């Protein structure tokens, strides 16, 4: 089950993929709306993978241990430069969450892409599968791949004051190590913006 994804000049290859989960759409809707007056431009230099550390999954983590990451986070690269140098921005996300442990480990993680989420209760976690999601199960895979489009109230938004998407990782079943399992699993995220459009260039600092 070898899958190789290529964003910009960055590549990511996994040999234990269960496919790509497209969420809410398989393509992008119109980007040339009446709110930008035709001044939008595409920045293909920002469609690259950047790496962030989500958490450390251990036998301690019981069900309901939930970690959230609002995707337009602190980016030290071209994407952050666009955020600081443009008023309005638009993009979707291509998220690859890796929990590399061992095939002798047990338990299960649920990786979801929730729009407009700030906090979640334990009961609502039971329906977290309503969102574009995958399961990371160490017996069968160690990588979840989800693609979502731009999705918001407006066609373009100000990412300084609004985070449309949230990557959510929850522990469905506790990690079991037994004898031959990994003591802990470091859950990381590899995220790539897709179809980046900017409008309204800002003055210099």
């Amino acid at each position, epitope marked *: 089950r070898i899958l190789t994804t290529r964003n910009g000049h960055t590549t990511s290859t996994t040999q234990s993929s269960v496919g790509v989960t497209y969420g809410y759409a398989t393509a992008e809707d119109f980007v040339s709306g009446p709110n930008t007056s035709g001044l939008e431009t595409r920045v293909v230099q920002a469609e690259r993978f950047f790496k962030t550390h989500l*958490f450390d999954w251990g036998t*301690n983590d*019981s069900f309901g*241990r939930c970690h959230l990451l609002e995707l337009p986070t602190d980016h030290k690269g071209v994407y952050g430069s666009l955020t600081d140098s443009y008023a309005y921005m638009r993009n979707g996300w291509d998220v690859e969450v890796t929990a590399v442990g061992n095939q002798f480990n047990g338990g299960c993680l649920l990786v979801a892409m929730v729009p407009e989420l700030c906090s979640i209760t*334990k009961r609502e976690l039971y329906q977290l599968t309503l969102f574009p999601h995958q399961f990371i199960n160490p017996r069968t895979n160690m990588t979840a791949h989800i693609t979502v489009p731009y999705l918001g109230v407006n066609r373009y938004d100000q990412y300084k004051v609004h985070k449309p998407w949230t990557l959510v990782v929850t522990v469905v079943a506790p990690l079991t190590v037994k004898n031959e399992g990994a*003591p*802990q699993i470091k859950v990381y995220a590899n995220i790539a913006p897709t179809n980046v459009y900017v409008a309204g260039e800002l003055p210099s600092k």
Partner: antibody
Amino acid sequence: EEKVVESGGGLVQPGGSLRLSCVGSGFNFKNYEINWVRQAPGKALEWLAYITQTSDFIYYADSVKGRFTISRDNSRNTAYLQMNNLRTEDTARYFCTRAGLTGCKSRHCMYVWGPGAEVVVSS
Amino acid sequence: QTVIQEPAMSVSLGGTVTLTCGFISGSVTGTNYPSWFQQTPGQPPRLLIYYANSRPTEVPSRFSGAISGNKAALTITGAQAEDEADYFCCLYKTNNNILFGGGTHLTVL
């Protein structure tokens, strides 16, 4: 620099109550778990309490379960340890610890330690 | 309690020493997530080893962690004069029971 400071200690009659305050600077207090430990003069460290990022999971040591209460306020970048029914065995230096480090996003890290506040319980 | 450490150990300058951390009844594995701290008098402890083999970036390469003989081991190789301190052992055993060792006082001759 990532640092934490503890306040609210002192000398208190046994049977009383008091609240330790932990103030953290140099990091996002919302993204880190907080442990409260204590060290008796000339003795070994003893872990007391643990709270997660959003106060959803809270654990106490069996010696201080029910007696103590750990909470946090992320807006104020503070953590609180309210101690009630203090006994003479609790005279110690209390440390507020931030569990988290580059390459360590669990509770078994205990990286950042404060100078600790002294609590003296005697009659 | 239930955690056994050597009460005190001595190492020659530039030598190699191994501090050890066991249970009274049982084996220390990776599931216990052993951690090693160093403390000097009048100073808060600082983390040396986490996950029983990992060390922070700022910690020098002298300190190493391992799990050997069903016991957690902290090895100091080429000990300097700054290594004379009390070394503590944190072990995880269920969510609400975090154990600490007695503490080994290491002195450099």
